[PDB]
Amino acid sequence: KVVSTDEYVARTNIYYHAGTSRLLAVGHPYFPIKKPNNNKILVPKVSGLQYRVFRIHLPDPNKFGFPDTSFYNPDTQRLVWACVGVEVGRGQPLGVGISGHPLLNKLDDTENASAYAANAGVDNRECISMDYKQTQLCLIGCKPPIGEHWGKGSPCTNVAVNPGDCPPLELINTVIQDGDMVDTGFGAMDFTTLQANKSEVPLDICTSICKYPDYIKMVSEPYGDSLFFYLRREQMFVRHLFNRAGAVGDNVPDDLYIKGSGSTANLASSNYFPTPSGSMVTSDAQIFNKPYWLQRAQGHNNGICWGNQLFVTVVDTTRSTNMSLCAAISTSETTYKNTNFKEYLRHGEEYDLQFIFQLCKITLTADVMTYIHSMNSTILEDWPLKKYTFWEVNLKEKFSADLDQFPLGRKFLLQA
């Protein structure tokens, strides 16, 4: 049986403030820039539709230097931090970014048509761009988040598999890391393994996995450590309706239509796909630059940061403007030529985080020791995530008890 943390955790009246100064990231919005001979990255990939996972490290309160010590007994008490307030400051102006493919697989525009496509070609690919759906989300926890996507499965060995067959599909749960791609209006699938022509989705997702958070599995966890708080807001609509070009994997049944003649002797493509569009960004619909108070979590864990560790996941596509840069090769010409200038694309992104923490103490009795050991063995030993990449935040040297000297501390003292 799982019990709430409010039973075996005692909260004191000591509060601390923590915060980062400013985080910046500048890079190419579509692909990394790499040296031709080498494999070392010169310009990383920074996009507005990437998961931002911050892993925050806290001081050990047992070894922390407090002006007063009489409030607890080190012989039978142990200390831990609790989160009571978070703000995610978000710079840059509001904007919308677009992406596309120079060789995207589009056959025809089927929204309105007046002639029939009676002849097939060798290459019908086009240069198409669009803007993605609108999404904001924030997740806070003490364990890394969990996402889901569609991937290939293991086929049965009863019958053989011929080239060109439909791959089998299964649903896969993984851990979201820093730099992953969010859904853009095409689904949560592995585009590298489920698409072979490399020309069906834009350039920044054509060789990546799009993942969606697994809210149902996260909230059903018995201990509720992976999610203390979450906000989400997403929207989209359809702008264009197209076809796809290729060979027909599955034929239309003969009892759904009447055969034609002349131009309509053969059938056109039935692999319709839409073009997504986020509508419009406004200041009134923003979930950032606002303080969140963590009064009572939904799960049994109520903001206790076991292991001196915090995880913050952020997605915000409402500031995704890409900047165009131009450099002149030769300036000794008074008439414009296309070949005298070079074009570049850049994206910059700005972050700020600030937190209010409360000090708690735990009495280690035999029953409490047994329960905590059953919950997590490493906690007692201290008194794994080495193959994942997160944005590391080190707050071991940024705490202050002067709570009213900071913007978030003033609000915290004002609400109470």
Q: Which of residues 98-137 bind a second copy (CB under 8 A)?
A: 98-103, 106, 108-114, 116-117, 120-131, 133
Phi then psi dihedrals of residue 115, to 5 deg = -135, 160
Length in residues, the chain: 416
Q: Which of residues 277-306 bind a second copy (CB under 8 A)?
A: 277, 279-284, 289, 298
- Our finding on whether 338 is near a second copy (CB under 8 A) is yes
Q: Does residue 333 sit in helix, strand or coil?
A: coil
- Our finding on whether 10 is near a second copy (CB under 8 A) is no
Q: Which of 13, 261, 295, 374 binds a second copy (CB under 8 A)?
A: 261
Q: Which of 243, 301, 313, 358 binds a second copy (CB under 8 A)?
A: 243
Toward a second copy, which CB reaches closer, 60 or 352?
Answer: 352
- Our finding on whether 328 is near a second copy (CB under 8 A) is yes
Toward a second copy, which CB reaches closer, 11 or 300?
Answer: 300
**Start-to-end Cα distance in the chain:** 35
Distance CA 265, CA 259 (A): 7
Q: Kindly calculate the radius of gyration of the chain based on its CA atoms and give it in whole angstroms.
A: 27
> Looking at the DSSP assignment, which residues form a beta bridge with residue 181?
50, 210
Nearest one of 74, 62, 4 to 304, comparing CA atoms:
4
Q: Which of residues 199-228 bind a second copy (CB under 8 A)?
A: 199-200, 203, 206-207, 212, 214-216, 219-220, 222
Nearest one of 306, 19, 296 to 143, comparing CA atoms:
306
Toward a second copy, which CB reaches closer, 268 or 380?
Answer: 268
Q: Which of 65, 67, 74, 93 binds a second copy (CB under 8 A)?
A: 93
- Our finding on whether 400 is near a second copy (CB under 8 A) is no
Distance CA 242, CA 111 (A): 7
Toward a second copy, which CB reaches closer, 70 or 295?
Answer: 295
Q: Which of 57, 290, 373, 410 binds a second copy (CB under 8 A)?
A: 410
Site string for a second copy, 24-63 (x = CB under 8 A): x-x-x-xx-xx-----------------------------
Distance CA 239, CA 276 (A): 6
Distance CA 297, CA 224 (A): 9
Instruction: Provide the minimum distance between the beta carbon of 15 and a second copy in the complex, in angstroms, as a whole number.
Output: 17
Q: Which of residues 67-86 bind a second copy (CB under 8 A)?
A: none
Q: By the 8 A CB rule, do 90 and 287 touch?
A: no
- Our finding on whether 317 is near a second copy (CB under 8 A) is no
Q: Which of 23, 194, 294, 379 binds a second copy (CB under 8 A)?
A: 194
Toward a second copy, which CB reaches closer, 308 or 322?
Answer: 322
Nearest one of 88, 56, 140, 89 to 312, comparing CA atoms:
140
Taking CB under 8 A as the binding criterion, the range among 46-54, 77-85, 244-252, 384-392 that sits at the site for a second copy is: 244-252
Toward a second copy, which CB reaches closer, 308 or 313?
Answer: 313
Q: Which of 12, 76, 264, 378 binds a second copy (CB under 8 A)?
A: 264
Q: Pairing relation of β-strands 210-213 and 181-182?
A: parallel
Q: Note the Cα 213 to chain centre separation in Å.
A: 8
Name residues whose C-beta falls within 8 Å of residue 297's C-beta, 6 or more positions apart in sequence.
224, 228, 229, 303
Instruction: Provide the minimum distance between the beta carbon of 53 and a second copy in the complex, in angstroms, as a whole number.
Output: 19
DSSP code per residue over 60-98: -TTTS--S--TTS-TTTEEEEEEEEEEEEEE-S--B--E
Toward a second copy, which CB reaches closer, 59 or 246?
Answer: 246
Q: Which of 329, 380, 385, 413 binds a second copy (CB under 8 A)?
A: 329
Site string for a second copy, 148-187 (x = CB under 8 A): x-x------------xxxxx-x-x-----------x-xxx
Sheet of 309-316, strand order: 134-141, 309-316, 52-57, 391-394
Q: By the 8 A CB rule, do 325 and 345 touch?
A: yes
Distance CA 134, CA 173 (A): 24
Q: Which of 159, 160, 258, 366 binds a second copy (CB under 8 A)?
A: 258
Q: Which of residues 341-360 bind a second copy (CB under 8 A)?
A: 341-346, 348, 350, 352
DSSP 193: H
Q: Does residue 375 sit in helix, strand or coil?
A: helix
Q: Which of residues 358-397 bind a second copy (CB under 8 A)?
A: none
